[PDB]
Design a protein around this ligand. Sequence first.
Ligand SMILES: *[C@@H]1O[C@H](CO)[C@@H](O[C@@H]2O[C@H](CO)[C@@H](O[C@@H]3O[C@H](CO[C@H]4O[C@H](CO)[C@@H](O)[C@H](O)[C@@H]4O)[C@@H](O)[C@H](O[C@H]4O[C@H](CO)[C@@H](O)[C@H](O)[C@@H]4O)[C@@H]3O)[C@H](O)[C@H]2NC(C)=O)[C@H](O)[C@H]1NC(C)=O
Ligand SMILES: *[C@@H]1O[C@H](CO)[C@@H](O[C@@H]2O[C@H](CO)[C@@H](O[C@@H]3O[C@H](CO[C@H]4O[C@H](CO)[C@@H](O)[C@H](O)[C@@H]4O)[C@@H](O)[C@H](O[C@H]4O[C@H](CO)[C@@H](O)[C@H](O)[C@@H]4O)[C@@H]3O)[C@H](O)[C@H]2NC(C)=O)[C@H](O)[C@H]1NC(C)=O
Ligand SMILES: *[C@@H]1O[C@H](CO)[C@@H](O[C@@H]2O[C@H](CO)[C@@H](O)[C@H](O)[C@H]2NC(C)=O)[C@H](O)[C@H]1NC(C)=O
Ligand SMILES: *[C@@H]1O[C@H](CO)[C@@H](O[C@@H]2O[C@H](CO)[C@@H](O)[C@H](O)[C@H]2NC(C)=O)[C@H](O)[C@H]1NC(C)=O
Ligand SMILES: *[C@@H]1O[C@H](CO)[C@@H](O)[C@H](O)[C@H]1NC(C)=O
Ligand SMILES: *[C@@H]1O[C@H](CO)[C@@H](O)[C@H](O)[C@H]1NC(C)=O
Ligand SMILES: [Ca+2]
Ligand SMILES: [Ca+2]
Ligand SMILES: [Cl-]
Ligand SMILES: [Cl-]
Lengths: 422, 422
Amino acid sequence: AAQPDPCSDENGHPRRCIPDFVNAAFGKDVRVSSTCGRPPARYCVVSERGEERLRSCHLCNSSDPKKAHPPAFLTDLNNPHNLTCWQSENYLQFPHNVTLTLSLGKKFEVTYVSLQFCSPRPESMAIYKSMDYGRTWVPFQFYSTQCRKMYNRPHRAPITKQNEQEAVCTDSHTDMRPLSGGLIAFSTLDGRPSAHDFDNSPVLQDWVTATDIRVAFSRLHTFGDENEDDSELARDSYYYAVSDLQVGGRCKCNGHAARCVRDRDDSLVCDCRHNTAGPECDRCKPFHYDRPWQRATAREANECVACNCNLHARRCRFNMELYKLSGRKSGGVCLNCRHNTAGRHCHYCKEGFYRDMGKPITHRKACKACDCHPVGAAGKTCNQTTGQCPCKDGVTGITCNRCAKGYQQSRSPIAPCIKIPV
Amino acid sequence: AAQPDPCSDENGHPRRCIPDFVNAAFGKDVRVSSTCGRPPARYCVVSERGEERLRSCHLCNSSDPKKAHPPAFLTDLNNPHNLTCWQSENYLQFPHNVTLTLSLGKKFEVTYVSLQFCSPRPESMAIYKSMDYGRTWVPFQFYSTQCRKMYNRPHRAPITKQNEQEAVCTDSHTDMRPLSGGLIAFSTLDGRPSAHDFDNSPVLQDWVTATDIRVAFSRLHTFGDENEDDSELARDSYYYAVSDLQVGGRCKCNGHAARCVRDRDDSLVCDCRHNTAGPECDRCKPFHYDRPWQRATAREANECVACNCNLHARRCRFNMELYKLSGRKSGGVCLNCRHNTAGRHCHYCKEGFYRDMGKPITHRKACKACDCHPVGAAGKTCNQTTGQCPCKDGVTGITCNRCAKGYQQSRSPIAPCIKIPV
Ligand SMILES: *[C@@H]1O[C@H](CO)[C@@H](O[C@@H]2O[C@H](CO)[C@@H](O[C@@H]3O[C@H](CO[C@H]4O[C@H](CO)[C@@H](O)[C@H](O)[C@@H]4O)[C@@H](O)[C@H](O[C@H]4O[C@H](CO)[C@@H](O)[C@H](O)[C@@H]4O)[C@@H]3O)[C@H](O)[C@H]2NC(C)=O)[C@H](O)[C@H]1NC(C)=O
Ligand SMILES: *[C@@H]1O[C@H](CO)[C@@H](O[C@@H]2O[C@H](CO)[C@@H](O[C@@H]3O[C@H](CO[C@H]4O[C@H](CO)[C@@H](O)[C@H](O)[C@@H]4O)[C@@H](O)[C@H](O[C@H]4O[C@H](CO)[C@@H](O)[C@H](O)[C@@H]4O)[C@@H]3O)[C@H](O)[C@H]2NC(C)=O)[C@H](O)[C@H]1NC(C)=O
Ligand SMILES: *[C@@H]1O[C@H](CO)[C@@H](O[C@@H]2O[C@H](CO)[C@@H](O)[C@H](O)[C@H]2NC(C)=O)[C@H](O)[C@H]1NC(C)=O
Ligand SMILES: *[C@@H]1O[C@H](CO)[C@@H](O[C@@H]2O[C@H](CO)[C@@H](O)[C@H](O)[C@H]2NC(C)=O)[C@H](O)[C@H]1NC(C)=O
Ligand SMILES: *[C@@H]1O[C@H](CO)[C@@H](O)[C@H](O)[C@H]1NC(C)=O
Ligand SMILES: *[C@@H]1O[C@H](CO)[C@@H](O)[C@H](O)[C@H]1NC(C)=O
Ligand SMILES: [Ca+2]
Ligand SMILES: [Ca+2]
Ligand SMILES: [Cl-]
Ligand SMILES: [Cl-]
């Protein structure tokens, strides 16, 4: 409304535009492996304060909305002082994997994934992404007190330039453990050495990109003393619960759009600009092949450029050697010049025709036929630039259609203009 | 031998030449209708002196050479004081036609026909020519005392410009009649008003031309008184006799030869020069059609001119309009230029080729192909004068086979030379 076009300058010149930052999980329906309440079943909160165990107990009943704890409560608006949470099934045996999967449907770039717990935090969990609509999954971040044993990872691996795309493991989640309200937050870029100029890092750009997100919990904080780790069987306090799940980032458009939006088929997609196309504006638009696709940046917008064919070609092709040689200015090449033109830009007239000046090069019929005079000219093909036909001695005119001054017209087809003698 | 070429200058330049003047009848065998001596038979000379008739009589015997009087004696060398003469049969009735026919076999121009009589001269005779080898005959001159009656001609008709080709009749032969040694002489040109510049009179030129010559005698000078013209029957003095017949002129060559001469088949013909041909040098030689045939004159030789085709044509054609327009200099036109040349003189290179300078225009291969570079040039056909092909941007060379300074070679066939940018 009162927002001017972000994809272009105040002079109409292109500039980079990126969709707004969002929690991309807000309002979304998250898929989970486990939820309490079917069949209804009692659970207990355990309480630590002093040296006393208040085992407070309530009923998870999925058919009772006052007592239901559905995945929906993960991405509803979170009001503290009145929290809602999803809560897993109870009595979790070990080993296990209680998964939450957020499917975005469209590549985003993600700056963080975060959760607020109603229960205590897991001893162990992981976060994973899919960059391909959920056919494959890839570790994003690990949390655990036995990184090695549980996930086979070094604890707290330093991140090198050599692999800053590396999913590390840590126990930082354990620092100062409350049993409620526990926050975990994975910033995709914390501690990655190229973070400072993300804009020019393609490796981080890949790292942070995903279409879906999975968090899996695989071990509960052991309580009840666990003096005998013998107690394999579980209890009604053996569940996870979460009040809010967020995935912070923005829609992936390579700096060539100001928003994503819902098409026909209800699918999210970039509103591509800069004469770009594809769901992420990952490629140039037709006939806009003057130079290579580039992702925009702070300084350069890198719009896709229309190749020039002076209105004599439908299609266009990019040629890198030409680009290279031009000093990376232009490499487009026209195909099937159409109005008896020829050349790279359909910018000159095929032999057999010539350049009708006073009409401009863009003009349908900027190329005129050689209509060389049968008897006055010495051949059929005229000068493509100038129109001039090859004239016999004594002849003039563009088409050789006249004797010159000093000459007299014969009725010989071979020699039609003879010089006045003296 | 010690005679330099008469048909050319002392600088080798053409000049008019004409065969020598001859009596063309000398030595020739003349055909006659009547000769005495078969069978042998007595004849009489009648003699006038005082008032006495010496009827001297001798025998014409054709088998006796001391007494034979054959046509041969008409053109044998005449020695006066020892004359020889042919003599007709005797007893000539009236009317009659005793004819002598000289066949030259070749057109001559004739300045006179002359005869010396042994008998008295005829009262009436005529001379005729053939301009066509004796198929037709045409009056040349008439002699008679009754021009009107005998030849149906006005006596002594004045000659007008209006017909100076007119055969007149006269009685001049009768002036001071001896009975022996009588001379008659017809000069073809006496009294013809154009005679003075014959050289430029085509009508006299035609008048004097012939191939054969006939003299016919048709009435004898009446003697014996002829008091009674009743005497129809004739007598042994009623014959003609002639010692010498001459036909003065020269062989017809239109000023383009210094002699006639006897070819294969024994026929007389001009030794034509000035690049002329035909029995009278009446036409130009092959490939020598630059200008029209002309008869030579005192000032201008009017040689036939070779047309110029710079050694690229076998045949040649004359064109009068071109001649006219050139100011009557030249009108020749070459046919089937042969080494990929074209034009009037095969003097320029067909489209598809061009003029290889440093080789001369006469050179087989003075025309070189356009070998325009497939990728460097913008079309196949090059400049016929210069060789230059139509070059793409950045290309140079006659064949467009190189990038210019400032340009770099691509491996695109469309645009093979790109400018170094700045
Ligand atoms: C988890 O939470 C759910 C939701 O509260 C609880 O499930 C029960 O849900 C049913 C809903 O049907 C509630 O049943 C109620 O009690 C009646 C007792 O019997 C009388 O019913 C009819 C009244 O309509 C009389 O005509 C008849 O004479 C009986 O004496 C039920 O029968 C009623 O159900 C009625 O609902 C259906 C449609 O659902 C109608 O078509 C029928 O007519 C039917 O009568 C009535 O709704 C029940 O109260 C809920 N239980 C509660 C609140 O305790 C589970 O109980 C809860 N689970 C646990 C373990 O807490
Ligand atoms: C017009 O002019 C001609 C030419 O003079 C005259 O014709 C005569 O021509 C013949 C030529 O043969 C002359 O004849 C001569 O007189 C001979 C007389 O008879 C004797 O002949 C042979 C000699 O060879 C004897 O053996 C024999 O016993 C005879 O007694 C002729 O016979 C001769 O002719 C011989 O010639 C031929 C070839 O021609 C031979 O093969 C024969 O053997 C043959 O004998 C001999 O030549 C004759 O003299 C001529 N007459 C003359 C001079 O008066 C005409 O007379 C003349 N006409 C007129 C009217 O005047
Ligand atoms: C817990 O359940 C999830 C959801 O099905 C399992 O997902 C697999 O996870 C492994 C390891 O990350 C991947 O290699 C597979 O691609 C996932 N499969 C599917 C179908 O999504 C996960 O394996 C389970 N946990 C354990 C320990 O087995
Ligand atoms: C005398 O004889 C000559 C020779 O045959 C005749 O020639 C003809 O002459 C006439 C008149 O000149 C021509 O028209 C003919 O062409 C000639 N004919 C031939 C065959 O040559 C001539 O006619 C004779 N004289 C007379 C009076 O008849
Ligand atoms: C939020 O408001 C009150 C605060 O006391 C709470 O008890 C109630 O259950 C909540 N209402 C909702 C979530 O609709
Ligand atoms: C010519 O010479 C003499 C001269 O007296 C003459 O009588 C003779 O017949 C002639 N001889 C010839 C024509 O052979
Ligand atoms: Ca909530
Ligand atoms: Ca003689
Ligand atoms: Cl295109
Ligand atoms: Cl020729």
